[PDB]
Amino acid sequence: NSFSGYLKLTDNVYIKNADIVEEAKKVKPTVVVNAANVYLKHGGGVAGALNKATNNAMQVESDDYIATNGPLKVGGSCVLSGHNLAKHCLHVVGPNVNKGEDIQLLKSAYENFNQHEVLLAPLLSAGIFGADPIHSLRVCVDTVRTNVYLAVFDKNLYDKLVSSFL
Ligand SMILES: O=C(O)[C@@H]1CCC[C@H]1c1ccc2ncsc2c1
């Protein structure tokens, strides 16, 4: 958990313009959050980047979790191995508003972070899930009470977030 170059937005939310995969390799946090779908199929976005950094070990593991426990629900999560990136990976499903999923579930998605004292995470439901990233940051700030280090890859998005917040 040796985080560096973060900007403290609130008492418990910090932000940095960085690739979460690189942050994970440097810090080796206790928990790295994945922006997952209900079947834990890591095909693109941050899920694909995280899976690729474990050389498909996250996917083999996820396929075994799904065969044994069934799919997650939108707003839910599960804790799996973090492999070479972290001690644990917390897979969290935010709503896919581009597929008509309810934005009210984005609060439920963020409540999962509260079971862990410190997490390295991306913005939920942003990118391919189609929700407004600035709105996503607002729900994170209002919902998460534990210590969360948000890593934002796109510098244009990072600058919009820091401008809207501070
Ligand atoms: O922070 C971002 O720009 C987006 C917002 C939601 C998904 C994030 C993302 C997407 C892809 C990716 N690949 C490596 S780190 C990484 C992070």
Side-chain angles (χ1 to χ4, degrees):
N1 300 318
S2 42
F3 297 104
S4 302
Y6 285 76
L7 171 80
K8 192 181 203 177
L9 297 179
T10 69
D11 282 334
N12 63 284
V13 177
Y14 297 85
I15 195 174
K16 185 185 189 175
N17 175 207
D19 173 353
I20 192 168
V21 167
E22 293 300 306
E23 285 293 301
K25 300 178 178 175
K26 282 174 192 173
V27 170
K28 181 88 188 195
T30 301
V31 184
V32 68
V33 176
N34 177 34
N37 49 44
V38 296
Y39 279 93
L40 304 186
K41 286 308 193 178
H42 314 304
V46 75
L50 285 175
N51 182 50
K52 194 174 173 206
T54 76
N55 301 102
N56 220 47
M58 175 185 288
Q59 191 65 70
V60 175
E61 179 193 26
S62 300
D63 285 351
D64 177 57
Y65 174 88
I66 291 301
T68 304
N69 303 272
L72 293 174
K73 297 303 282 205
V74 181
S77 72
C78 71
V79 181
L80 283 178
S81 173
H83 306 276
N84 53 294
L85 300 181
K87 180 170 186 162
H88 308 294
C89 179
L90 181 69
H91 299 269
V92 177
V93 184
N96 185 336
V97 317
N98 283 342
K99 290 188 174 283
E101 297 172 3
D102 210 285
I103 187 80
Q104 266 291 178
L105 296 154
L106 185 58
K107 169 185 177 232
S108 302
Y110 278 119
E111 293 183 323
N112 293 286
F113 290 29
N114 293 329
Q115 314 298 348
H116 301 281
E117 272 283 309
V118 179
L119 319 91
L120 166 60
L123 285 180
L124 304 173
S125 292
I128 358 165
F129 274 0
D132 180 76
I134 325 169
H135 179 245
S136 187
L137 182 52
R138 298 274 182 217
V139 180
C140 181
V141 162
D142 299 344
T143 307
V144 181
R145 289 180 310 280
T146 58
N147 303 299
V148 62
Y149 287 78
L150 297 169
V152 181
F153 187 43
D154 191 333
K155 174 156 178 286
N156 297 118
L157 174 53
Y158 176 75
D159 290 340
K160 245 171 298 152
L161 299 168
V162 171
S163 165
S164 296
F165 203 92
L166 302 182

